[PDB]
């Protein structure tokens, strides 16, 4: 087994095709299924896996009450093969209310954060063994990507933030070998969706304070230098945001439109164009769409989209989304998952909060239309 290098061009992409769906909530009405949130997908060279942060309980369970709380000592990182729902046989790979995972070509790395809000601990588990650990540096809720990290030549990069102070850690076989502070014009960086862009790593993240345009972080694996900006596209990708006719953007600064909230999302470049996903509803996490914005990676005045696809209808709930990359015979493909959140507090028919997932992958072929929502009937679940 050799280290992954991702030294292949990005695949030609006309859009995205259906890949996977777990139907987790529908199954939990007749079976013991974990309560989860913040899921993501990552693949080793052989097969793909779905991850999620459990709540230490199943859904049909007295302990599923009040699972809207995001930090508890009972949250663990769940790992299953993609398509296997989180049943009672699921492996909890570490203790975590925030996490990131990636495969360097030889073994799995898990970054797992747990503990007190003012004094959290990030554990670094490589090939099933704890190798390193680091304490919160700002003493104010240490958190990380909630999606896959990226490894190149045995060096894995993960973005972590503390307090409102964002750092980029370089990990070799579980050992922190270098730490770089976030540099550039991105003012707030959270929950980065990173992907290999040889010879470096590119991340599209979430600005939870000042902008509805997503920040970008570029990581150089060789000299550990960091540069950061914002996605130029005049069609911004965060939620909440203004409508398409009145929204604006900027390549270096946050747009100062609908700050104070956000949602984890993704985008990746295709020449001067950008592929991105976002919620259809501009204010709430309803629906999910993907499209390409021509000149969207380099022109902040561009609002010309093409190749739109509805992933979730505007009347159905979505949630977090992120990117994962897969190495093919000749090119690196881009895929993404969508978290489909159900329950409290937006839905009062039940006492719990959980999610299912739907997964799409880039295609060079052709495709049609559809909608793949969670599909559970909360009114009937009691």
């Amino acid at each position, epitope marked *: 087994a050799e280290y992954r290098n991702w030294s292949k061009p990005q695949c030609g992409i006309t859009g995205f095709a259906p890949f996977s769906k777990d139907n987790s909530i529908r199954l939990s009405a007749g079976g013991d299924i974990w309560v989860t949130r913040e899921p993501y997908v990552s693949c080793d060279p052989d097969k793909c896996y779905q991850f999620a942060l459990g709540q230490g309980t199943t859904l049909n369970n007295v302990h599923s009450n009040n699972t809207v709380r995001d*930090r508890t000592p009972y949250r663990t990182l769940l790992m299953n093969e993609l398509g296997v729902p989180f049943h009672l046989g699921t492996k909890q790979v570490c203790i975590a209310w925030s996490s990131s995972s990636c495969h360097d070509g030889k073994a799995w790395l898990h970054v797992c954060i747990t503990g007190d809000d003012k004094n959290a601990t990030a554990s670094f588990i490589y090939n099933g063994r704890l190798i390193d650990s680091v304490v919160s540096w700002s003493k104010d809720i240490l*958190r990380t990507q909630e999606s896959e990290c990226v490894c190149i030549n045995g060096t894995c990069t993960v973005v972590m933030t503390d307090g409102n102070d964002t750092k980029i850690l370089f990990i070799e076989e579980g050992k922190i070998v270098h730490t770089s502070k976030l540099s550039g014009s991105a003012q707030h960086v959270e929950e980065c969706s990173c992907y290999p862009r040889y010879p470096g790593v590119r991340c599209v993240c979430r600005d939870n304070w000042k902008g509805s345009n997503r920040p970008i972080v570029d990581i150089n694996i060789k000299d550990h230098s960091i540069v950061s900006s914002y996605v130029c596209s005049g069609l911004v990708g965060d939620t*909440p945001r203004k409508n398409d006719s009145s929204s604006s953007s900027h390549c270096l600064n946050p747009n100062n439109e*609908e700050g104070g*909230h956000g949602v*984890k999302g993704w985008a990746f470049d295709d020449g001067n164009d950008v592929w991105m996903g976002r919620t259809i509803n501009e204010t709430s996490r309803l629906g999910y769409e993907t499209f390409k914005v021509v000149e969207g990676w380099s022109n902040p005045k561009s609002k010309l989209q093409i190749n739109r696809q509805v992933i979730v209808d505007r009347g159905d709930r979505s949630g*977090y989304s992120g990117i994962f990359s897969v190495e093919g015979k000749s090119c690196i493909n881009r895929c993404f998952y969508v978290e489909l959140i159900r329950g409290r*507090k937006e839905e009062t028919e039940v006492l719990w909060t959980s999610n299912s997932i739907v997964v799409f992958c880039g295609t060079s072929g052709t495709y049609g239309t559809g909608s793949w929502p969670d599909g559970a009937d909360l009114n009937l679940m009691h």
Partner: antibody
Amino acid sequence: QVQLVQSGAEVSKPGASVKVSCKASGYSFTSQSLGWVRQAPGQGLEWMGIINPSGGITNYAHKFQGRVTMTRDTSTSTVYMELSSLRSEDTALYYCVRDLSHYNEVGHDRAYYYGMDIW
Amino acid sequence: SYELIQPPSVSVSPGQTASITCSGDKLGKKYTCWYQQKPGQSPVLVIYQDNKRPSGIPERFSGSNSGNTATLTISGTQAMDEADYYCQAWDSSAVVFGGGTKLTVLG
């Protein structure tokens, strides 16, 4: 120039209901949660609940569950507090507050505790 | 339901250092706030996140939270500092206030 201006004083009969309003300005209305703290004459502060103007989700203190309704109108940058089944011990000064905290109970992914910076 | 315990009254002389405590079960694990209410006006946030001062708050006001007690400290107290002081924390997202402490600058 952040400020909250509240409605005028009210006298109400026991058993009825009272509705107080509060207009926010100096910042984007949808960016921060707004709440209500009351103070009986000569007593301490007592939190009633909060509303997130982005989504309208509310979170009330247990003592007032079933008695209070908080609403928001984003077009007018105004929140309201309606307390029903009024009793004599509801005589108090009712403060409108801006809570910079992020509560899971009103739609935030990561809970974050700050405090009430504007009254 | 969680409860915060404050002394009802604390007295100092001009220029002295006042210390107001606030006690609760494992209070050091949680975030605390301090509010200053002068007679006739609304409360004012003087300390948030255990020891942070909002811009415009004098640096005489300091805060600390360790173990089971939170403490607000006012060095070189002036007459204008006479007010009621409330500690504040959270119990499962529910805001909780201390009973309040009357601060008197002895005249």
